[PDB]
């Protein structure tokens, strides 16, 4: 019997960039699927150098079919045509991402399987066996924030759809078999169910059989953490960020700009990154230079930061209130990325001790 499995029970909602929207440049997302820096990092307009890269999450599909393991100690590939179907469902409406198992070919996105002709559907190619004696085939497929059912909640962004066929146009028909309904745009919302369809050519009974695995899209709040509350100026700050939705790929550890966090104190207010004030990023000397995820399937991001003795042309004082605030853009109450702009901050104290002065006599 064939079986299909997914890496994670839940997956984060993908996010796009400014170039994926036809709206004019704005200092705020204005409901778009954009993940920019905290307001102080943007100068009146969000451009390509001040937002996170494209957030197409890469889901890996795995099947366990010993029938396709024809070679016990050799390479095997699932060559059955269109045996795997990847689709996204939101209630009563369904959209299919593509087909797998046949030869890789160019195609558009079908909605609800309305297109009878299968050659017009995008094909991801034949899945490759993970190990010569395993029998499990894995295919890596990325899902864009546009690859979802049409809805009116996503009209806030005049989305530009990347073409999946040979044409270079950015129109809706280039990526999807049919244009979106007037007043609605293709997108993925919170709570949407991601499902994988695999048709086994031969089960234990040697006939056709359909198996399914499901995952749910979700968005979670972000919370900072530190190993301790007080810090000596110039010491090492183990800044730990625990937030699930940044774990886009379970097979690798991604990196994200430190600019998402901001320095807020009496000395200065800066994003502590390359987009901050002059001489800022040097003061902390990040190691690594950006937020780095602890493990490929953990979702926790950590980075070593040094407490600056001076932020920008002025020193940092003892007992100063240190505020580390970052904007999630994806809180629990957000239907999608860029809907709610909730911010979360952390309080950090500096070392205070008695500076007693004594004389010999």
């Amino acid at each position: 019997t064939g079986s299909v499995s997914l890496d994670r029970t839940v997956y984060p909602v993908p996010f796009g960039t400014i170039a994926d929207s036809s709206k004019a440049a704005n200092a705020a997302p204005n409901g778009r699927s954009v993940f920019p820096i905290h307001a102080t990092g943007i100068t009146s307009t969000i451009d390509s150098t001040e937002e996170l890269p494209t957030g197409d999450l890469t889901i890996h599909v795995r099947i366990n079919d010993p029938d396709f393991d024809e070679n016990p100690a050799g390479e095997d590939a699932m060559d059955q045509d269109n045996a795997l179907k990847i689709s996204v469902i939101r209630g009563s409406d369904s959209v299919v991402l593509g087909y797998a198992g046949a030869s890789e070919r160019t195609g558009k996105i079908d909605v609800g399987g309305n297109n009878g002709t299968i050659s017009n559907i995008r094909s991801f190619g034949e899945m490759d066996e993970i190990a010569p004696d395993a029998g499990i085939f894995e295919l890596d497929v990325n899902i864009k924030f546009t690859d979802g059912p049409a809805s009116a909640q996503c009209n806030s962004h005049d989305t530009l759809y990347t073409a999946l066929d040979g044409t270079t146009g950015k129109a809706d028909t280039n990526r999807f078999d049919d244009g979106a309904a007037s007043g609605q745009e293709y997108c993925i919302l919170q709570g949407d169910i991601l499902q994988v369809e695999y048709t086994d050519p031969a089960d234990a009974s040697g006939d056709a059989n359909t198996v399914t695995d499901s995952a749910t899209f979700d968005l979670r709040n972000g919370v900072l953490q530190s190993d301790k509350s007080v810090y000596i100026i110039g010491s090492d700050m183990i800044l730990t960020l625990i937030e699930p939705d940044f774990d886009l790929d379970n097979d690798s550890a991604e990196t994200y700009d430190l600019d998402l966090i901001e320095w807020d104190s009496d000395a200065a207010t800066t994003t502590m990154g390359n987009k901050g004030v002059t001489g800022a990023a040097a003061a902390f000397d990040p190691e690594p230079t950006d937020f780095r995820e602890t493990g490929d399937s953990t979702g926790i991001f950590q980075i070593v930061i040094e407490i600056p003795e001076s932020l920008s042309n002025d020193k940092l004082e003892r007992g100063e209130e240190i505020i580390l605030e970052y904007t999630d853009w994806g809180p629990s109450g957000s239907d999608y990325v860029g809907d709610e702009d909730e911010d979360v901050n952390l309080t950090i104290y500096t070392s205070n001790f008695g500076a007693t002065v004594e004389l010999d006599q």
Partner: protein, 578 residues
């Protein structure tokens, strides 16, 4: 299989059985981890390839008799069969003056390497007075093209041209592997070809692009549908085996046409001399290679390494079915990622080939070698083996917690991924170039600015968290509180160790394959502090200060951590004084 002949002597006939054997390709690392710069044997046991019991049989792509060769590939390299089954023909005649084979030359010039291909055909004296067609076959793993044709070897036979079309392949099927070197941050294109079976004195290869059919070919004087249809790659090479770096002209010409890439086909051309005899079977192997990364290059989507590797296994003994080979792999680092020599220095076709690894390929993506085989039953079942090539977290530390003046500090860097050859001693020099932002840093002069810092920055030594650099360039004119310049002050103090480059501090590997690099230098009494690191060349302070009491810190830039990404690690120490 199974049909046999009976040879009889002394009225005791012996039966000559024909047959096949179950093979088993195995990769045996010398230890429990296949780290970079470690040549490990590859053992292939296949009695089908042992066709002579009194001699040694060596596998060869150029030998049509050797039907099956093990192969390894990563990414999507552009082989000869990416567009399906190709069509190859042979032609005799003259190229003429309006041809890229004669007028063209390798000079990285648009006119020099890109032009038009024209020819005239005189095949009346040939059999049937027609172009020499052939039967084309492709191997599933080595991707070798085997050409079957009439085995005419008469003295009057003379053939010069050879035109081959890659089935339905187009510029779209080529741009997935061939990348634009001008637009990508880091990217190189390589062309590997093997035409040794032809036995030609000189070999010339050109790339053809046209919106119509390749067979039969046309001429400029006949039609003007295509503005340009010839891109010269190899011109009169004396070696049939060559792995040459393509010039930027080829990459520009690939993207140099404004027409639709899907509406124009691609063709491959051959011109050679001294091939007046053709065997029954001929083999043509010529693929495209590509390596590099785009933008920040931290995610796996922007890291690509398209190559195909074939192992030339050699028989162990005269009558031993065990064929022995070996695999080499170098893990690319931040220093050699911008140098085309390290990509061109690998051997694609040899008994001990080498290949590039861009990411800590483990689990399902581990480097896997493929080898077809005819089993004892008679099916062509494949046998494959894989070995993980993970990365390691570089650790750098100093021998002591505190150091005196001229205490001869030594830097010990243990990271097995920087070993790029098990034979040669791996070394890393220090950059001495004021113009580049990586001045006085270990690495290479070439450097690109990214989100993780400088590409050419490998290791730095810092006093008081300030990089130790020698005053140079036009930004060292500051004199400070006095009228003496920092460089002049250091010269007066007698400190010839004005910087990292002055000391000659370089990283040298402990052994051939140890993977641990040892470097050392003496701490100077006086050093020149850098006023600001935000400009190149660095602007130095006008007065020197004594290094005692300051904390000496090193920073080894690790291009690939244990998970296979950039992690900044260093060690700390203090310059003691009494």
């Amino acid at each position: 299989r199974g049909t046999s002949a009976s040879l009889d002597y002394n009225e005791t006939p012996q039966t000559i059985l024909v047959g096949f054997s179950f093979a088993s390709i195995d990769i045996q690392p010398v230890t429990d981890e296949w780290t970079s710069g470690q040549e490990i044997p590859v053992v292939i046991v296949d009695a089908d390839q042992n066709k002579n019991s009194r001699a040694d049989e060596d596998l060869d792509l150029n030998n049509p008799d050797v039907t099956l060769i093990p192969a390894l590939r990563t990414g999507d390299p552009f082989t000869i069969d990416e567009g399906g089954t190709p069509s190859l023909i042979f032609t005799n005649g003259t190229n003429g003056d309006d041809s890229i084979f004669d007028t063209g030359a390798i000079n990285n010039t648009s006119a020099g390497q890109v032009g038009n291909f024209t020819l005239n055909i005189n095949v009346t004296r040939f059999s049937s007075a027609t172009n020499i067609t052939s039967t084309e076959s492709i191997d599933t793993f080595s991707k070798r093209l085997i050409s079957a044709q009439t085995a005419n070897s008469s003295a009057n036979f003379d053939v010069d041209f050879a035109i081959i079309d890659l089935g339905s392949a187009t510029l779209e099927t080529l741009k997935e592997t061939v990348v634009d070197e001008d637009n990508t941050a880091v990217g190189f294109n390589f062309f590997n070809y093997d035409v040794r079976s032809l036995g030609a004195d000189t070999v010339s290869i050109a790339l053809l692009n046209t919106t119509g059919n390749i067979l039969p070919w046309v001429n400029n004087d006949t039609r003007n549908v295509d503005k340009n249809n010839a891109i010269l790659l190899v011109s009169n090479s004396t070696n049939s085996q060559a792995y040459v770096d393509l010039t930027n002209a080829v990459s520009d010409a690939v993207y140099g046409s404004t027409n639709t890439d899907s509406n124009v086909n691609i063709g491959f051309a051959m011109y050679f001399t001294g091939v007046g005899d053709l065997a029954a079977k001929e083999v043509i192997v010529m693929d495209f290679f590509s390596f590099g990364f785009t933008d920040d290059g931290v995610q796996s989507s922007e890291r690509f390494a398209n190559q195909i590797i074939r192992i030339e296994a050699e028989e162990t003994g005269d009558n031993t079915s065990t064929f022995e080979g070996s695999l080499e792999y170098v893990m690319v680092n931040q220093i050699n990622i911008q140098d085309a020599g390290t990509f061109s220095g690998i051997t694609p076709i040899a008994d001990d080939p080498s290949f590039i690894v861009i990411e800590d390929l483990t689990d399902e993506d581990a480097p896997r070698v493929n080898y077809n085989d005819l089993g004892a039953d008679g099916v062509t079942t494949p046998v494959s083996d894989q070995e993980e090539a993970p990365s390691h977290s570089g650790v750098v530390s100093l021998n002591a917690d505190s150091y005196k003046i001229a205490d001869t500090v030594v830097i010990t860097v243990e990271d097995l991924d920087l070993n790029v050859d098990s034979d040669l001693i791996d070394i890393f020099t220090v950059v001495s170039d004021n113009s580049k932002a990586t001045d006085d840093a270990v690495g290479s002069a070439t450097t690109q600015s990214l989100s993780f810092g400088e590409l050419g920055r490998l290791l730095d030594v810092t006093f008081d968290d300030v990089i130790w650099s020698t005053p140079d360039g036009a930004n060292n004119t500051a004199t400070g509180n006095d009228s003496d310049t920092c460089s002049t002050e250091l010269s007066n103090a007698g400190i010839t160790d004005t910087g990292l480059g002055a000391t000659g501090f370089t990283l040298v590997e402990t052994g051939a394959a140890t993977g641990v690099f040892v470097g050392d230098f003496q701490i100077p009494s006086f050093w020149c502090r850098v006023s600001d690191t935000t400009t190149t060349p660095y602007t130095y302070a006008g007065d020197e200060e004594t290094t005692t009491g300051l904390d000496i810190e090193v920073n080894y830039v690790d291009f690939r951590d244990a998970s296979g990404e950039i992690v900044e690690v260093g060690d700390s120490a203090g310059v003691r004084a009494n």
